[PDB]
Motif scaffolding. Sequence first.
Motif, short mmCIF file in Angstrom:
data_model
loop_
_atom_site.label_atom_id
_atom_site.label_comp_id
_atom_site.label_asym_id
_atom_site.label_seq_id
_atom_site.Cartn_x
_atom_site.Cartn_y
_atom_site.Cartn_z
N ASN A 59 0.78 -1.23 -0.02
CA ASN A 59 -0.07 -0.07 -0.14
C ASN A 59 0.71 1.13 0.15
OD1 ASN A 59 -2.37 -1.70 0.41
ND2 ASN A 59 -3.56 0.12 1.42
N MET A 96 -2.75 4.91 8.15
CA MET A 96 -2.85 3.43 7.96
C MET A 96 -3.02 2.89 6.69
SD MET A 96 -6.41 2.69 9.70
CE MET A 96 -6.20 3.82 11.24
N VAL A 97 -3.48 3.88 5.67
CA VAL A 97 -3.88 3.46 4.22
C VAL A 97 -2.60 3.15 3.56
CG1 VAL A 97 -3.98 5.83 3.59
CG2 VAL A 97 -5.50 3.92 2.61
N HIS A 104 0.65 -2.04 9.82
CA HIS A 104 -0.97 -1.79 9.62
C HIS A 104 -1.72 -2.06 10.72
CE1 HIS A 104 -4.90 -3.01 7.77
NE2 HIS A 104 -4.91 -1.88 7.65
N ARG A 108 -4.54 0.28 12.81
CA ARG A 108 -5.89 0.07 12.47
C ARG A 108 -6.19 -0.02 13.74
NH1 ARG A 108 -9.37 -1.41 7.41
NH2 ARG A 108 -11.43 -2.28 8.57
N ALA A 234 -10.06 10.53 5.24
CA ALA A 234 -10.50 9.24 4.71
C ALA A 234 -11.99 9.60 4.55
CB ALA A 234 -10.17 8.23 5.35
N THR A 238 -14.82 11.56 0.37
CA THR A 238 -15.62 10.57 -0.22
C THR A 238 -17.15 10.45 0.36
OG1 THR A 238 -14.81 9.15 1.64
CG2 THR A 238 -13.43 8.89 -0.30
N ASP A 284 -7.07 3.16 -6.71
CA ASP A 284 -6.77 2.60 -5.67
C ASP A 284 -5.38 1.77 -5.86
OD1 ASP A 284 -6.24 2.02 -2.64
OD2 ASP A 284 -8.04 0.80 -2.63
N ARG A 286 -1.34 -0.08 -5.60
CA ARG A 286 -0.51 -1.13 -4.97
C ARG A 286 0.92 -0.90 -5.81
NH1 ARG A 286 -4.10 -0.66 -2.10
NH2 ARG A 286 -5.47 -2.30 -1.03
N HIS A 343 -7.29 -3.58 4.44
CA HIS A 343 -7.49 -2.44 4.31
C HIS A 343 -8.93 -1.83 3.98
CE1 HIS A 343 -3.36 -0.94 4.54
NE2 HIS A 343 -2.94 -2.30 3.70
N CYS A 345 -12.51 -0.67 3.98
CA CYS A 345 -12.91 0.66 4.55
C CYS A 345 -13.62 0.44 5.85
CB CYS A 345 -13.76 1.29 3.65
SG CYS A 345 -14.10 3.28 4.50
N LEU A 350 -20.49 3.41 8.49
CA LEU A 350 -20.75 4.93 8.74
C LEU A 350 -21.23 5.60 7.61
CD1 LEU A 350 -20.30 6.47 11.40
CD2 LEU A 350 -18.40 7.72 10.13
C1 HEM Z 1 -18.31 6.89 0.35
C2 HEM Z 1 -17.62 6.85 1.40
C3 HEM Z 1 -16.18 6.08 1.39
C4 HEM Z 1 -15.62 5.42 0.20
C5 HEM Z 1 -16.03 5.10 -1.15
C6 HEM Z 1 -14.29 4.97 0.83
C7 HEM Z 1 -13.32 4.22 0.46
C8 HEM Z 1 -12.28 3.40 1.12
C9 HEM Z 1 -11.42 2.60 0.33
C10 HEM Z 1 -11.64 1.75 -1.00
C11 HEM Z 1 -10.48 2.19 1.16
C12 HEM Z 1 -9.28 1.18 0.89
C13 HEM Z 1 -8.07 1.78 0.55
C14 HEM Z 1 -6.84 0.96 0.35
O1 HEM Z 1 -6.96 0.08 -0.29
O2 HEM Z 1 -5.91 0.93 1.39
C15 HEM Z 1 -10.65 3.09 2.24
C16 HEM Z 1 -9.88 2.99 3.34
C17 HEM Z 1 -10.20 3.65 4.64
N1 HEM Z 1 -11.32 4.55 5.02
FE1 HEM Z 1 -12.87 4.79 3.57
N2 HEM Z 1 -14.42 5.37 2.32
C18 HEM Z 1 -15.40 6.01 2.58
C19 HEM Z 1 -15.61 6.42 3.76
C20 HEM Z 1 -14.90 6.48 5.09
C21 HEM Z 1 -15.31 6.97 6.12
C22 HEM Z 1 -16.71 7.86 6.52
C23 HEM Z 1 -14.34 6.88 7.04
C24 HEM Z 1 -14.06 7.12 8.52
C25 HEM Z 1 -15.10 7.59 9.42
C26 HEM Z 1 -13.35 6.09 6.32
C27 HEM Z 1 -12.03 5.88 6.82
C28 HEM Z 1 -11.07 5.01 6.13
C29 HEM Z 1 -9.92 4.37 6.66
C30 HEM Z 1 -9.38 4.68 8.21
C31 HEM Z 1 -9.38 3.72 5.59
C32 HEM Z 1 -7.97 3.08 5.98
C33 HEM Z 1 -8.31 1.68 6.28
C34 HEM Z 1 -6.91 0.59 6.29
O3 HEM Z 1 -5.88 1.16 5.49
O4 HEM Z 1 -6.97 -0.23 6.93
N3 HEM Z 1 -13.73 5.95 5.05
N4 HEM Z 1 -11.77 3.74 2.10
#
Ligand code: HEM
Length: 406
Positions: A59, A96-97, A104, A108, A234, A238, A284, A286, A343, A345, A350
């Motif tokens: 990542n 963390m992303v 990681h 997380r 994050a 989005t 997204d 890699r 990873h 989401c 939420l």
């Molecule tokens: C429509 C809304 C959202 C979409 C489409 C979305 C999409 C994504 C995607 C595709 C990833 C994976 C990225 C990767 O491959 O590492 C990701 C990771 C993450 N998202 Fe979302 N997200 C959304 C909303 C949110 C919300 C509301 C939060 C928190 C309140 C959030 C927090 C995070 C966090 C912390 C990660 C890191 C996860 C990790 O690395 O383990 N996202 N998001």
Amino acid sequence: SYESIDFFTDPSLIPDPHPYFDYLRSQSPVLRLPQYGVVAVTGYEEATAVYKDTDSFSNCVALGGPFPPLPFAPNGDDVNAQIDAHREQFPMYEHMVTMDPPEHSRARSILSRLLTPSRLKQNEEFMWRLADRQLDEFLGAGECEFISEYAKPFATLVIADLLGVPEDDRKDFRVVLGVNPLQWLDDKFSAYIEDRRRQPRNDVLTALATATYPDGSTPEVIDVVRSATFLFAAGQETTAKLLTAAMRVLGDRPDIQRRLRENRSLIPNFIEESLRMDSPVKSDSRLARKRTTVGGLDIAAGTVVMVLPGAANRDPRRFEDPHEFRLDRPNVREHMAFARGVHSCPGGPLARVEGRVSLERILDRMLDIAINEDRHGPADDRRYTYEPTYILRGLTELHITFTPAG
Ligand code: HEM
């Protein structure tokens, strides 16, 4: 033509990338692009394979892929030592992303006390009050620019509530996150955690300040701040794009608006189809950590492998009639707008709830929701503007009209 077009720079792909995505996928669901050596993944089962394989795919370049250039010259069949030696040079390296195992899991884990069923229940009930407060701000006008007046403030204030921000600070969070905002965020949360660690309270910030890693050790303050504050970056943009994409369909498809109004239980399926059709994370990425194979393609170490979640969500091998917006899709929840693997989401639940609660009160309080024709033209000749970025899919603005129900 698409044979030599540059996905990362050509503005002709910003309005609608799916004809291009379809052209790529018909060549191969895993395709070497004409520039930068990037392997573009437009297939659903191939994207799933990439996402679930952390040993082969790092990542470190998740956000931008081929931009910025790697902080080293890749060579050999293994670039893990080079990634480690420049770990702190990738964009958002502190979050963390961009982390791989073992970093990681530790980062997380700090989120866990924020995402309990008890906490999400309280945050969900809060969203009903927040939706009404936000709608109070502009309902009387009968029109609004939905992103700036509802979607962005709402998404900001939900995350602030999730993090237990003191009530008297929430207005400042909306203003600043609406001056270096990242540094302002770090400073605010640093003091929060430092204060709760010296004098614990019965609040959310103290639960954050007293969390432990999976091995039992105590995180440093900077590591709690990094995990916690990252939820804004994050989850703000989005989620704002998803709410606005939902509204765009409500105005452009009055038949769907009609069905939802009369059967509110269709709202979750509407939000899922919105995520499938208008996936806010457009690319997204890699980095191949070693020589590996996906979709039958031999990928060398150091190659950027770019998942296109919106393209995987239109793979006809998985979704019949994939360009059709349908409330009937029984497998709509199988979309990968939130990715897959370690990873995946954490804000997926939420975001779904923000969509459902927002549209519930929107439909309650807005009759006859329509797109502003002075700003966007007629219903079959709309003039929309999408953000000029290859990583995010979202409207820049959406001007709507409505008859207030009150
Ligand atoms: C429509 C809304 C959202 C979409 C489409 C979305 C999409 C994504 C995607 C595709 C990833 C994976 C990225 C990767 O491959 O590492 C990701 C990771 C993450 N998202 Fe979302 N997200 C959304 C909303 C949110 C919300 C509301 C939060 C928190 C309140 C959030 C927090 C995070 C966090 C912390 C990660 C890191 C996860 C990790 O690395 O383990 N996202 N998001």
